[PDB]
Amino acid sequence: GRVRTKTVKKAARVIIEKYYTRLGNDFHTNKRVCEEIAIIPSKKLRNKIAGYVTHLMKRIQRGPVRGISIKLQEEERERRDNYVPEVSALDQEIIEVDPDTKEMLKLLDFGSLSNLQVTQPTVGMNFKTPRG
Amino acid sequence: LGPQVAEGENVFGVCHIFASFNDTFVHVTDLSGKETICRVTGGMKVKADRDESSPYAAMLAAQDVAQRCKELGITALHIKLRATGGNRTKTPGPGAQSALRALARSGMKIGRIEDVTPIPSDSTRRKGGRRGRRL
Amino acid sequence: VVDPFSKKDWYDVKAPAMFNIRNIGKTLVTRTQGTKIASDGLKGRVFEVSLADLQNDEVAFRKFKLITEDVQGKNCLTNFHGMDLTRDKMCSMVKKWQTMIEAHVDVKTTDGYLLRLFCVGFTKKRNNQIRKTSYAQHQQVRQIRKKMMEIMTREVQTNDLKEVVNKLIPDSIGKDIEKACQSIYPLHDVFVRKVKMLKKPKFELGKLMELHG
Amino acid sequence: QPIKLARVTKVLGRTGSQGQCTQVRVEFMDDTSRSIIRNVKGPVREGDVLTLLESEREARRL
Amino acid sequence: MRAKWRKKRMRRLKRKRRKMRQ
Amino acid sequence: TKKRRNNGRAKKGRGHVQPIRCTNCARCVPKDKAIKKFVIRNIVEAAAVRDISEASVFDAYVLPKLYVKLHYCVSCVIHSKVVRNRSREARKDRTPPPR
RNA sequence: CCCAUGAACGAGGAAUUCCCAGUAAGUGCGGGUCAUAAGCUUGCGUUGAUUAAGUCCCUGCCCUUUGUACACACCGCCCGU
RNA sequence: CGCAAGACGGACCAGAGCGAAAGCAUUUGCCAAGAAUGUUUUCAUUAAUCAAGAACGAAAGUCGGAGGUUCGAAGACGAUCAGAUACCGUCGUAGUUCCGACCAUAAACGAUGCCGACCGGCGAUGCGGCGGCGUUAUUCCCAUGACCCGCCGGGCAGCUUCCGGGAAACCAAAGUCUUUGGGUUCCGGGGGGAGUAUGGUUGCAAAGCUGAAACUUAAAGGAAUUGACGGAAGGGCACCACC
């Protein structure tokens, strides 16, 4: 079995979180930087950590990572997330509204609006699921 | 023996298959059922009481029945499948499917399959005790 | 040791004229020998033939029992003895969230054929119905049963056996009952469950021959 | 029964008391509209052809 | 012992006492 | 202690329920306590379907169905593995298995 | 170390050890044995396999739910004559 | 294929209904009851619970009559077993069925008296009533029936809640209890001895009701917890398991 242990996974997580900038997509560079920046007493353990580091980097390349969060990239995450459509989806010149909400608005002193268009109510009250 | 008939028409018999849990009967009779053509049971095909209702014994009985009824010209067979009925089990015994498959495979032409096990509107007291069979 | 089938002869069994297919199959009987007459041993026979083997486009879950009323010239002329539904149909209609209304009548035809007719119907769940069950109340059930009995009597006592069978083949009695009971409680699967010949007039060859064509 | 070969298209899994039978979808290269479950014996890969002198029987499935 | 059978045994003793006591 | 709020049956609002017989052992079990199964199957099994279909003297005859009503006493239900013991919390689930 | 004869065995009816690649098996060597002393044992090369990429059928063991009147814990507890 | 007999009313049949409970399931008719609902009807406190007394009371059992299909205590026999006087099998008497008369007991249980008030939510379901789009049977129509959406009252229940309670399990009652009093009946006081003895009383009997003490004993018991175990179920692993 080739399942990574919580020691290797945790160390690789800490390495990505703290030393993201130096870490790259190549395994060998990951191994060298992990040797340089952390005391990893075993070459095999170094290599396991470097492999998980590489896989985690590919995971971030896919996009979001569920198991880690780095603020140095979270700022740019929020930078991308500031998406403003040119025309607001809430500014529709015609809004279909039901007669009951029409009556509610008329009682709300908003019966003189011009964007509202009354809708035909359903002819039946068959909304429940058949029991059984 | 058998009636002369065109080779494209099938003369029908009725195969009452009594699939009990202790024995299986394959009984081909006249369409009216009053005249018996052949009847073979599982116990005429094995020597062990435990195997009287086995699928193999029913298979042997059904093949014997099919051969005998073919030598009298009957080519098609209506099926009346029944369990014990009454108080006892309504589920047919293990030999029902075996007999049906054997009869189909033995060159017989299956007609209409019907289930005729005796169902009461309500019956006498069942053979078991109030607490049933405890073994 | 000697097979008793060497002296058995085969007779064609004919259905009454109300059915499209006349040849319902082949019976057999031992040849006459003194007291044992082949003719007398052929008249008690009952053939339970599916209607689909008696009619062409009709359903197969309705069986008719025909009793061999006379034999002549290797031809066993039968007559209507009764009718039934197959076990599968009866078991398939009885479901667990509906009322089954049953009725029966003892009614004589115009030609003296006393028949016991059984009718079964089931209450029908509506298209928009949310409630799981579709039970009819006791007075509603009694009214539906009364309507079923009146319709069965009306359809039998004013007709003879020929017309009674002719309206049993399409089950027009069940359709009439279902139509008439939709104002009491909508019925779902209405059928004449079983017709049994209670009593029959004494045998006459003329009515048989008029029946066979 | 007519002789008609079938090619493996998917290895469904293992069955049997000791887990020796293998459920596998097999397709006949005559119409590619039939793909029946067959239990097979022995080491079975994906993509071979199984000679079938008998096809009226089906493997337990669903 | 079972309470029902204890009661049955007690009733048997009572029957014996009833018959013996003249 | 009291195991079930419904006492293992469905008898609420009435005093007596007519018994029935277990289809396996013939034990007298109250009707609303007996475990009922409605078996819907074919008189011809799946393996035998093709032989009967190709031995038929009809076309699209369709095989008849068999309709079985089984009533099991609790011991027979448990032995036949149609119901099982459930955890103290899973016991409360009256939802039938999806099947 | 030397010099013919012979018991016995034709794959060993029950019941079954142990076996995932330099593995099983095929043999020789070296130690512990040891004043001489290996059918044992502990290591070693020496030939290379149709077989398995699976399962809970058996044998067990573990876990979960469940019952318990057991807690010395079923080799328990306990009833009656 | 018929005939006869005596039972029994399948499926529909439900955490549905009715009844004081025991109990009650094929049409159909008759008879007399009954809850709930509706009510701008009537009386006007007539009520609640109840020693005494009374009606009913599963099954088994008892006495007499009829019947007697099935099942079936007892009993006979066949198996199993070390032995089985049992479980299992073939029979099979009383009984099981009906009528009359006794018996009055059940884990007769919701192991929870009845009447009244108050205290959450939710979806169902049965009955009655009320209101409402629409669909359907509705033949110039309204009705009414089947649905659909609500509401009200009385029921059988269910889910949920940190109402509160409780040893807890659990209970919307088993809550409104040391912040202890709405009314009232029955009834318990460690475990055995023992529902025994005796007396009385009821019964044809079987037995029912009432019902001790000597003596003996440091626990018996309830709920829940963790283990261990199961001839309980479901998963997983293992060439010291199998294939």
From Swiss-Prot, chain A:
**Where in the sequence is N6-succinyllysine found?**
18
Return the GO cellular component terms, semicolon-separated: cytoplasm; cytosol; cytosolic ribosome; cytosolic small ribosomal subunit; focal adhesion; membrane; nucleolus; nucleoplasm
Query: Does the record carry Ribonucleoprotein as a key word?
Result: yes
A single GO molecular-function term is: RNA binding
Phosphoserine occurs at 112
Q: One Pfam family of this protein, by short name?
A: Ribosomal_S17e
Question: Its principal location?
Answer: cytoplasm
Q: Which UniProt keywords apply?
A: Cytoplasm, Diamond-Blackfan anemia, Isopeptide bond, Nucleus, Phosphoprotein, Ribonucleoprotein, Ribosomal protein, Ubl conjugation
The record's subcellular locations are: Cytoplasm; Nucleus, Nucleolus
Q: Which GO terms describe its biological process?
A: cytoplasmic translation; erythrocyte homeostasis; ribosomal small subunit biogenesis; rRNA processing; translation; translational initiation
Q: Which residues in this protein are found as Phosphothreonine? A: 129
The record, for PROSITE patterns, names:
RIBOSOMAL_S17E
Record location of the Glycyl lysine isopeptide (Lys-Gly) (interchain with G-Cter in SUMO1) cross-link:
102
Biological role stated in the UniProt entry: Component of the small ribosomal subunit. The ribosome is a large ribonucleoprotein complex responsible for the synthesis of proteins in the cell. Part of the small subunit (SSU) processome, first precursor of the small eukaryotic ribosomal subunit. During the assembly of the SSU processome in the nucleolus, many ribosome biogenesis factors, an RNA chaperone and ribosomal proteins associate with the nascent pre-rRNA and work in concert to generate RNA folding, modifications, rearrangements and cleavage as well as targeted degradation of pre-ribosomal RNA by the RNA exosome.
User: Entry's NCBIfam families?
Assistant: PRK01151.1 (NF002242)
User: Known PANTHER family for this protein?
Assistant: 40S RIBOSOMAL PROTEIN S17
Q: Which family does it belong to?
A: Belongs to the eukaryotic ribosomal protein eS17 family.
Q: What is the protein's name according to its record?
A: Small ribosomal subunit protein eS17
Give the organism, scientific name. Homo sapiens (Human)
Give the encoding gene's name.
RPS17
UniProtKB/Swiss-Prot annotation, chain B:
Q: How is this protein annotated for GO cellular component?
A: cytoplasm; cytosol; cytosolic ribosome; cytosolic small ribosomal subunit; extracellular exosome; focal adhesion; membrane; nucleolus
Where is the stretch described as Disordered?
A: 115-135
Where is this chain primarily localised?
cytoplasm
- Name its species: Homo sapiens (Human)
Q: Which UniProt keywords apply?
A: Cytoplasm, Isopeptide bond, Nucleus, Phosphoprotein, Ribonucleoprotein, Ribosomal protein, Ubl conjugation
Gene Ontology terms describing biological process: cytoplasmic translation; erythrocyte differentiation; maturation of SSU-rRNA; negative regulation of transcription by RNA polymerase II; ribosomal small subunit assembly; ribosomal small subunit biogenesis; translation
Position(s), cross-link Glycyl lysine isopeptide (Lys-Gly) (interchain with G-Cter in SUMO2): 45, 47, 90
Q: What superkingdom heads the lineage?
A: Eukaryota
Subunit relationships: Component of the small ribosomal subunit. Part of the small subunit (SSU) processome, composed of more than 70 proteins and the RNA chaperone small nucleolar RNA (snoRNA) U3.
Q: What is this protein called?
A: Small ribosomal subunit protein uS11
| A Pfam entry, by short name | Ribosomal_S11
- Known PROSITE patterns for this protein? RIBOSOMAL_S11
UniProt feature, compositional bias: Basic residues? 126-135
Q: Which family does it belong to?
A: Belongs to the universal ribosomal protein uS11 family.
Q: Per the record's keyword annotation, is Nucleotide-binding included, yes or no?
A: no
Q: Which residues carry this modification: Phosphoserine?
A: 123
| Listed NCBIfam families | PRK09607.1
Localization, per the record, is: Cytoplasm; Nucleus, Nucleolus
**Residues modified to Phosphothreonine:** 117
Provide a Gene Ontology MF annotation, just one. Answer: structural constituent of ribosome
UniProtKB/Swiss-Prot annotation, chain E:
What keywords tag this UniProt record? Cytoplasm, Ribonucleoprotein, Ribosomal protein
Gene Ontology CC: cytoplasm; cytosol; cytosolic large ribosomal subunit; endoplasmic reticulum
Q: Could you tell me where this protein is found in the cell?
A: Cytoplasm
Return the InterPro entries for the record: Ribosomal_eS32
Q: Name one Pfam family in it.
A: Ribosomal_L41
The region called Disordered is annotated at: 1-22
Q: Which GO terms describe its biological process?
A: cytoplasmic translation; translation
* GO molecular function terms noted in the UniProt entry: mRNA 3'-UTR binding; mRNA 5'-UTR binding; RNA binding; structural constituent of ribosome
Protein family according to the UniProt entry: Belongs to the eukaryotic ribosomal protein eS32 family.
Relate the assembly described in the record: Component of the small ribosomal subunit.
Q: What does this protein do?
A: Component of the small ribosomal subunit. The ribosome is a large ribonucleoprotein complex responsible for the synthesis of proteins in the cell. Interacts with the beta subunit of protein kinase CKII and stimulates phosphorylation of DNA topoisomerase II alpha by CKII.
Please share what else the UniProt entry notes about this protein. Initially thought to be part of the large ribosomal subunit. Crystal structures show eS32/eL41 to be a small ribosomal subunit forming a bridge at the interface of the 2 subunits.
Full protein name: Small ribosomal subunit protein eS32
Q: Which organism is it from?
A: Homo sapiens
Curated annotation (Swiss-Prot), chain F:
Q: What's in the keyword line of the UniProt record? A: Cytoplasm, Diamond-Blackfan anemia, Disease variant, Endoplasmic reticulum, Phosphoprotein, Ribonucleoprotein, Ribosomal protein
Subcellular location(s) per record = Cytoplasm, Cytosol; Cytoplasm; Rough endoplasmic reticulum
Task: Write down which residues bear the modification named Phosphoserine.
Answer: 53
One annotated GO molecular function is: cadherin binding
Mainly resides where?
cytoplasm
Q: Does the keyword Amino-acid biosynthesis apply?
A: no
Provide one Gene Ontology biological process annotation. cytoplasmic translation
Basic and acidic residues composition-biased segments: 86-96
The UniProt entry, under InterPro entries, shows: Ribosomal_eS26, Ribosomal_eS26_CS, Ribosomal_eS26_sf
What's in the GO CC field?
cytoplasm; cytoplasmic side of rough endoplasmic reticulum membrane; cytosol; cytosolic small ribosomal subunit; extracellular exosome; membrane; nucleoplasm; ribosome
Q: According to the UniProt entry, which disease involves this protein?
A: Diamond-Blackfan anemia 10: A form of Diamond-Blackfan anemia, a congenital non-regenerative hypoplastic anemia that usually presents early in infancy. Diamond-Blackfan anemia is characterized by a moderate to severe macrocytic anemia, erythroblastopenia, and an increased risk of malignancy. 30 to 40% of Diamond-Blackfan anemia patients present with short stature and congenital anomalies, the most frequent being craniofacial (Pierre-Robin syndrome and cleft palate), thumb and urogenital anomalies.
Protein role: Component of the small ribosomal subunit. The ribosome is a large ribonucleoprotein complex responsible for the synthesis of proteins in the cell.
Similarity field: Belongs to the eukaryotic ribosomal protein eS26 family.
Q: How does it assemble?
A: Component of the 40S small ribosomal subunit.
Q: What is this protein called?
A: Small ribosomal subunit protein eS26
